[PDB]
Amino acid sequence: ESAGELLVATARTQARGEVLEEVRRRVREALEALPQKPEWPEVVRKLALEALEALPGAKALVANPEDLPHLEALARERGVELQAEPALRLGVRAVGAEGKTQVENSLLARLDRAWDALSSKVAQALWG
């Protein structure tokens, strides 16, 4: 007798999950398109500064080879070496003085770290 209620509840839950997943996929596709926009240098600069101030005494800052040109001056003023790392994309990475600690600011990390907190906001905006 409760089978119908269970089926309806499962359908509603999976539908809401599908809408949320669509939102997340769209935000992913948008974030990966950020570099092409003319404001990308500002984003790179701010992320690099956040990483540097979040890793006191950092030895070196690692960024995409195509992105270090936007970081040529910032590294010199802060006195930290730069390195070319093709694997990292749309993000910056920092390596500590000890060499055993590092900080990553890749936009995917930010997305998948703040998604849990922003899920309530997405839910209340979609189905408020």
Partner: protein, 471 residues
């Protein structure tokens, strides 16, 4: 908050413990991800922090972890669980991740799993009588709403069936109490710590039969599951239960299937940490740790919800002196202790009433709550059953031929008690039926021996024979 700091530099991996040196920014108690070379992510909690290194207890097996490609990253400083009213009808695993295939839930609050103490000033006195339908519990070991009443089981005793039956049959009696007549049901939170597939299959099948899986949250840590994940399961369950009860006015019934397994996990961690043990190797802080779980039940002034706990634990060798039952009984508000002797005789539920107890019983029985004769009837039943057991011991050494008439009446009472009050099978007995049976049984004794029952009650209820009920 929005950035990922990764700690390479692990110096030690042995058993459940991991040491990471330069992690001076990890908070005490924080939750971390351990990423190995192959990319598998495993969890863990910080249980010691210093400028030298941080001790991390891992929540999974350490196979494949190396000191070169393994890294530790932070998830959060305080272990919190996302909590939504839409958790009802969902099945989660020990660490609270879905295992039913449905999408992860959207939280309304993220509450710490440890929780906080309930202020004694805020607490309300539990006074609502819950009818379980089992005479030994209802009449002699009454359960109220807002109580911690565990079941003390054995290796092969049917405690799981008793828990399933209590969940199936539980209800308040608004008619007998005088308060508003409402038929709101219980919301059942079910925490399985190291449960076998047989027991879990039984529980799931029973709940599906009763249609209670819609109003139940399940946190399942099986026997093949990691052992150190059991530290978090009861705390996640109680976080959910407290949320529902004291923010959405639910009456929550929480079942913690095997607390022995939990205590074993605690011992594993403590032994790894060189903690000074108490008795039988269990950590010295086991009492406090168990109180952090059991004391998360009750009722609060100015709110309509409640939390009720029915923990189930297996006494290792049917030993009540073992640390786990001992500390639990020192913490909880009574216990229902099963008996293997009654089990062998075929009595179900095999509940021995002499070692059982319900502290809060007097708050939920009497005039205006169940019935005026309740308390004195229970006291008299205990007296008569104790006399019967003593007379059995006397016969074991002297033989039936020497027994006086009153002694034989008490023996017959004990046997009839075991066969008609304790033994009920799967049957929902209203408190009135249970009192009627108790009275029919006490009628086997002369009027004057009922020293614990007031004269007026004796006049109003004594005399009916047991044949009037059956046959």
């Amino acid at each position: 908050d929005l950035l990922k700091k990764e700690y390479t530099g692990i110096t030690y991996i042995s058993g459940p413990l991991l040491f990471v040196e330069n992690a001076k920014d990890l908070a005490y108690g924080a939750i971390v991800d351990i990423k190995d070379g192959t990319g598998r992510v495993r969890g863990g909690q910080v249980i010691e922090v210093s400028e030298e290194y941080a001790v991390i207890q891992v929540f999974e097996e350490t196979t494949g972890l190396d000191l070169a490609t393994t890294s530790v990253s932070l998830v959060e400083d305080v272990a919190r669980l996302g909590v939504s009213k839409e958790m009802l009808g969902r099945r989660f695993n020990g660490i609270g991740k879905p295992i039913d295939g449905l999408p992860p839930i959207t939280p309304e609050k993220r509450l710490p799993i440890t929780g906080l103490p309930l202020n004694p000033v805020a607490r309300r006195k539990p006074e609502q009588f819950i009818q379980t339908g089992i005479s030994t519990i209802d009449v002699m070991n009454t359960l109220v709403r807002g109580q911690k009443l565990p079941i003390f089981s054995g290796s092969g005793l049917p405690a799981n069936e008793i828990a399933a039956q209590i969940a199936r049959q539980a209800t308040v009696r608004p008619d007998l109490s005088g308060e508003g007549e409402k038929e709101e049901p219980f919301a059942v939170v079910f925490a399985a710590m190291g449960i076998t597939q047989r027991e879990l299959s039984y529980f799931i099948q029973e709940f599906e039969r009763t249609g209670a899986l819609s109003r139940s949250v399940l946190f399942l840590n099986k026997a093949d599951d990691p052992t150190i994940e059991r530290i978090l399961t009861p705390r996640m369950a109680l976080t959910v239960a407290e949320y529902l009860a004291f923010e959405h006015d639910y009456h929550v019934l929480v079942i913690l299937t095997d607390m022995t397994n939990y205590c074993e996990a605690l011992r594993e961690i403590g032994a790894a940490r060189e903690e000074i043990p108490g008795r039988r190797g269990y950590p010295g802080y086991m009492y406090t740790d168990l109180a952090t779980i059991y004391e998360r039940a009750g009722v609060v002034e100015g709110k309509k919800g409640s939390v009720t706990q029915i923990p189930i634990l297996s006494m290792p060798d049917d030993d009540r002196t073992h640390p786990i039952p001992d500390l639990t009984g020192y913490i909880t508000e009574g216990q229902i202790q099963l008996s293997r002797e009654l089990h062998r005789k075929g009595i179900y539920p095999p509940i021995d009433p002499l070692p059982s107890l319900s502290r809060l019983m007097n708050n939920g029985v009497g005039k205006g709550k169940t019935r005026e004769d309740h308390k004195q009837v229970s006291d008299q039943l205990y007296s008569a059953y104790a006399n019967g057991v003593d007379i059995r011991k006397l016969v074991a050494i002297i033989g039936e031929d020497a027994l006086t008439e009153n002694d034989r009446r008490y023996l017959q009472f004990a046997d009839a008690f075991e066969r008609f009050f304790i033994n009920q099978g799967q049957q929902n007995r209203s408190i009135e039926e249970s009192l009627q049976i108790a009275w029919a049984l006490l009628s086997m004794l002369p009027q004057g021996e009922l020293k614990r029952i007031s004269k007026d009650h004796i006049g109003k209820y004594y005399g009916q024979k047991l044949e009037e009920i059956w046959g």
